[PDB]
From Swiss-Prot, chains A, B, C:
GO terms for biological process: amino acid transport; cognition; glutamine transport; hydroxyproline transport; L-alanine import across plasma membrane; L-alanine transport; L-aspartate import across plasma membrane; L-cystine transport. The keyword Membrane applies. It is linked to Spastic tetraplegia, thin corpus callosum, and progressive microcephaly: A neurodevelopmental disorder characterized by thin corpus callosum, severe progressive microcephaly, severe intellectual disability, seizures, spasticity, and global developmental delay. Most patients are unable to achieve independent walking or speech. It is found in: Membrane; Melanosome. GO terms for molecular function: amino acid transmembrane transporter activity; chloride channel activity; L-alanine transmembrane transporter activity; L-aspartate transmembrane transporter activity; L-cystine transmembrane transporter activity; L-glutamine transmembrane transporter activity; L-hydroxyproline transmembrane transporter activity; L-proline transmembrane transporter activity. This is Neutral amino acid transporter A. Expressed mostly in brain, muscle, and pancreas but detected in all tissues examined. It catalyses: L-threonine(in) + Na(+)(in) = L-threonine(out) + Na(+)(out); L-serine(in) + Na(+)(in) = L-serine(out) + Na(+)(out); L-cysteine(in) + Na(+)(in) = L-cysteine(out) + Na(+)(out); L-alanine(in) + Na(+)(in) = L-alanine(out) + Na(+)(out). Sodium-dependent neutral amino-acid transporter that mediates transport of alanine, serine, cysteine, proline, hydroxyproline and threonine. The chain crosses the membrane at residues 7-27, 53-73, 84-104, 164-184, 204-224, 245-265, 275-295, 320-340, 365-385. Changing E203K: In SPATCCM; does not affect localization at the cell surface; decreased uptake of L-serine and L-alanine; Vmax is decreased by at least 50% for both substrates; 3-fold increase of affinity for L-serine; 2-fold increase of affinity for L-alanine.
Amino acid sequence: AGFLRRQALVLLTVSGVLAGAGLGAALRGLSLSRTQVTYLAFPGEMLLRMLRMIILPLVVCSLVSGAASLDASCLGRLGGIAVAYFGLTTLSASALAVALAFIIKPGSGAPKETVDSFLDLARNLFPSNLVVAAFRTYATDYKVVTQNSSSGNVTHEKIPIGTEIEGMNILGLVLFALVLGVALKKLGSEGEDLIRFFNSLNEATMVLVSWIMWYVPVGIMFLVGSKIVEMKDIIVLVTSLGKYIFASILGHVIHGGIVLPLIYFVFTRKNPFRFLLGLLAPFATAFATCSSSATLPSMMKCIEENNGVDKRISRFILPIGATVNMDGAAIFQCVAAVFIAQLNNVELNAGQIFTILVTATASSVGAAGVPAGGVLTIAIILEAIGLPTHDLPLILAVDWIVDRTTTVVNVEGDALGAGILHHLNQKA
Amino acid sequence: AGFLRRQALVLLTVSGVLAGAGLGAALRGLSLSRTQVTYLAFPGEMLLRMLRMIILPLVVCSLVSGAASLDASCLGRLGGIAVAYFGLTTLSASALAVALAFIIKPGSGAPKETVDSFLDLARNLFPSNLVVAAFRTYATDYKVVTQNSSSGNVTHEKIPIGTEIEGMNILGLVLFALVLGVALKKLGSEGEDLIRFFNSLNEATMVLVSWIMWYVPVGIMFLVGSKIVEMKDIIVLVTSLGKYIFASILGHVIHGGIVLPLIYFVFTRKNPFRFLLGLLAPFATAFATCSSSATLPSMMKCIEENNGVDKRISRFILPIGATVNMDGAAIFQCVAAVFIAQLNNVELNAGQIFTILVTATASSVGAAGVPAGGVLTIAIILEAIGLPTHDLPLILAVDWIVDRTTTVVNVEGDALGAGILHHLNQKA
Amino acid sequence: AGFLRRQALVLLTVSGVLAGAGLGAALRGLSLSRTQVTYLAFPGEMLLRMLRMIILPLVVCSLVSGAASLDASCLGRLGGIAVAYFGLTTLSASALAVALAFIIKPGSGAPKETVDSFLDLARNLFPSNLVVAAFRTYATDYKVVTQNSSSGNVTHEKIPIGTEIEGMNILGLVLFALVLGVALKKLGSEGEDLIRFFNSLNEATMVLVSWIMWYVPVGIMFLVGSKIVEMKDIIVLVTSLGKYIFASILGHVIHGGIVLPLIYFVFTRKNPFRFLLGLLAPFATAFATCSSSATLPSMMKCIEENNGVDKRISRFILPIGATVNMDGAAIFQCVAAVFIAQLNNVELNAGQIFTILVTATASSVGAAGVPAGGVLTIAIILEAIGLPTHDLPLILAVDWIVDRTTTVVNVEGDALGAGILHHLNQKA
């Protein structure tokens, strides 16, 4: 009876998804034309609608509230170096992840724009007014006027003129939110009350999505089967999913075992092998716990005597960096976004490669600690490009492994960051 | 001199409307083409514009503020039964009122959609984002694609696809407002300040409409005559109005004398005739006072000794239920909405029958106590369907009788509700 | 070194603009087709975008905050007369300025609507809902229906019907803001907290535009040269600018030396020449200081003994009137608006003459004290008509003279106002 209320929600979700698979496992189609099929997937559209419900208030409130507490008077003049280090390592992680994913091409088994579109991004960086930036944005298009064709430019003008196209710009909002966030804090405590306003609304708006969770197991079984009845193919999906998982885990391992150890060796001038020999058991328990936040004291408990670390920094910046610095998570969103991009065969559009990368890096200050918290990060970045999020569930049916894959590298990242900062402090 | 400032506003309004009627009572038309007529009704459009001014802030603020104070810790575990009773009796009242009005058909003397449109309502129940839901909503339409016509579906596809059509969705907003209202109260006193915010704005936004009242007598005389000059018929209007009033009063009497006494007899097992014999004078003074709130102490003063009632409940829930539970008012809005619907010959559209009914039931927590407070309820429900509200004045030129008709049944409703709750408590 | 940080920003701006002029002073065009020219003016469009960024929050917050502190309990029953005097003198100033500018016609050297469009303004005075009034408004158009052409109205109906056209209505918002501002103050201190909200946001939103100033010198040099390369004419621009400056200074002098002295003589019945003979040095130092706020004590220090003034009013209303009452500033915005209107050859449209005048008068309660504070006033009134603000810089390259021209008359205005109020108080 006690175990009934411990982890019931996950059991209900997995039972629902397997029941939906079994219902799709009926005889082949038993279906009429699209008239019957379309209205049999109604709750899935309903679930996506309720997920799109709160994309705006969360991104507009929680980001500002988080930016309000940032830059704590710069009490550590050498602390901003750590912030830049976190930013650059997240950037490099995202870049290598997307490059490797494009190299392996997972999910690809089964009117043009010139390269001068970058300025359009810069134009979408700053909306004309806030209200317009909520549903539609700016985009250029080339048309021929035959104005210079009269003399020497026959049959081709390529005159660029910008029009309005639906879809909001989360990119066009995050910078304004950050500017406002630093603004209402810089002037002093006289505008302090506004912070006490905003830092409430997030707590007021997050709770409701938990109730949305209570509906998730019901909806999923409706659209998973609704996806498999008409495909009639099972090998393609499982092969694509396996390739995606293999690519993601390979990227995580390659990042964790390579990128930061070189930087550590650059300034340590010693053996990184000696570092982790006394840390084998904390690493194992972090791998097993599936939640790096729970095993936080283990890192300090071991490295306090195993490694020549300081006492202040060991208990000063690590709690802060364990929530803001997420490493494998960004890899997860990147490999998921490119995965759906390859399923939908949309485009390469390096201009969009920059925007997805920057959104992934900027959203690394969002949900953390709780397992599978990056689903909202995936949703918002998918909304930033306007792709149908109806393929979302198939990514968290296997998250119970990518969680172990990502938490260990996420904690190792800021662990070695604290170590290299300790070494820097040893150099005075 | 003292009587000059007592009830001057009503005298000014009635003098203005009769003066406008007299100005329309000039020789038959004395009019040029529509060019002259259209710009001679300008202030009426101005009055409607100023009424549409504050439809959004009131409905978005007062509803949330009211929902914040709801569910007072459920201190009476048997109290929610009374809330359900009020909801069901209001629902039954609205249903019987609209059914009887459709039976009698008042005002009817002088591209098609299939029955599967209900889901569209459900789709409008949840907007994609709040900003879009302020001016336009979703609606499906059938078009032919001739995709299956190549084989066996010739000349007909009936493919449904949804488009955007102007007009907001008050239905698509009230549920979100209620959810937010329960949300900012459930988490605790830490978000309490937000309530102290909202419960201010209503008091800040209601006062101004009183100033709007100061303009009402001026505007009405402009458009009443502007309505009667071109019709040239007087019998139709008066006959329709008389039929409407007769239907409304018959519905009120039928509800009051029938629907609740049966429920009372079900659980009382005694004579309802003995109940009201000692209450004849309080009923008469409630009928004469035209304001049930003023005669509130009379109910308790009589039933304290005339009927075997309890002492706690007699002074505990009645003040609360005298403001939220309105009975004849809902009948009034229903019979008015169907009346303008029959004048305009729009449609039956049972799907709209559900939405008008649910809006009427949900708005029963709005303005109360003050006479003729339901005019805003009529306005908002008319806006919910997008009908021209230019026919509003003719409904409150006779409200001085429907007020007496409705207040007596409104007070008798929760009076007998308190009585049946007392009987339930007698059964322990 | 100390002088480096005193007035560095103005030096940087002027150096940037002269460098941009020198870069445009290269050999004649050295240019390819419009394809190259258009993308070489990108930062100018960027600067205009960042200026349009904060037009809405400032106008919606600062105006309400200012209106909240207005009408300080009417402690001086004769004080509202001064408010009406300020309003009427600003109105007369704007009227004479625009009339003289239209007479001189500066900058003019190098589908129709009937006169019944005034009601359209009144229709735009009150928007249907706040959200729609943020990007598009109402405007009528005449079309032919040939409905009465069948009998006697052949070939012409002129039926007016209103459609929606992009562009917001600042006029359609300021009155609502003022009404809300008086509303949340009239009900009492219970809604006081809301004021403490609004009067914060302005202080939160003004600071950021200072940072925008830090970018102004960089951007200007890009589009000034981009304006002069393709014109190839220098005489027209300098002649137009000189004519504009001469007209503005003539209008300022004519107003200051004429309009108010007559009113003073009407109620003083004495010699105005005797008034300013002892004030010659304060006037000179006000002319030299370029900032009337700095020389505020000089006025009272001289007129305390030179003129028979009272003691209370001399230090009671003058600090308040030195910030709200701006005189030459309104002349400046009027002559600038008409100047760009004549450059663009748009229209006369007396209906727009009323709206520009009323916006200029209402915005006279905005930025004051700081030199060249009226640039935002020019920007908002230009946005009210939807004209391209790309010609903004050329107006503040010479403001270093109009500042002296306008501050002296601005201070003389309320100085003589205080004098005439003192004379009125002498009459009891």
